[PDB]
Design a protein around this ligand. Sequence first.
Ligand SMILES: CCCCn1c(Cc2ccc3c(c2)OCO3)nc2c(N)nc(F)nc21
Length: 208
Amino acid sequence: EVETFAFQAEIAQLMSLIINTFYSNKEIFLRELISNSSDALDKIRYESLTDPSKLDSGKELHINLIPNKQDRTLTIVDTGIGMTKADLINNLGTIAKSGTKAFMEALQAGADISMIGQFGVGFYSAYLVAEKVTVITKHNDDEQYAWESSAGGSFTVRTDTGEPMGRGTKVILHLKEDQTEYLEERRIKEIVKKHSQFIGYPITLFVE
Ligand SMILES: CCCCn1c(Cc2ccc3c(c2)OCO3)nc2c(N)nc(F)nc21
């Protein structure tokens, strides 16, 4: 059974802004998702220093980027702390609300979209290149869950009966028809070299 939630109005407004505004530098969506993955891996690495059983769901700390041109998808896979249902439904919405006012306020005054990360809300950049995102995530104290959003001001959560994932988050970007460049290898590599070269954890770019 699928549950359907409305986004806070502010969120739904920022998703509309990112989907409507004309801005060509779409490629920063990647370094936002990787930086998010980086923060998540850093959390589980810290938590584990005082409670070693934390990495029973998996010791390896890495990011994968996985492009599939048959599915039209780019997947940003991490083995970080993951996300609870509470996070999905309630708390990321709660954290983001302040983030969105600030960003929005900075944008007249002439800051830009590439600066979204500075405000705690770069997840939403995905919607620069993805017509839907699906997020698969598993945190230790909790089940694995599938959140999905085509914007539209609603998002779903379900329990995921899919391939169990141990601990972490998969960001499945279902790309817009004209965004397929983000499935080439030479594309993904340049962007990672440019904006993500110093991430303290291995990033393996899969080929097809
Ligand atoms: C806002 C920072 C925390 C949430 N978060 C984010 C940003 C984010 C914000 C809002 C989101 C979302 C993801 O999926 C659904 O809605 N990425 C994460 C990740 N890879 N791993 C963990 F452990 N947490 C993540």
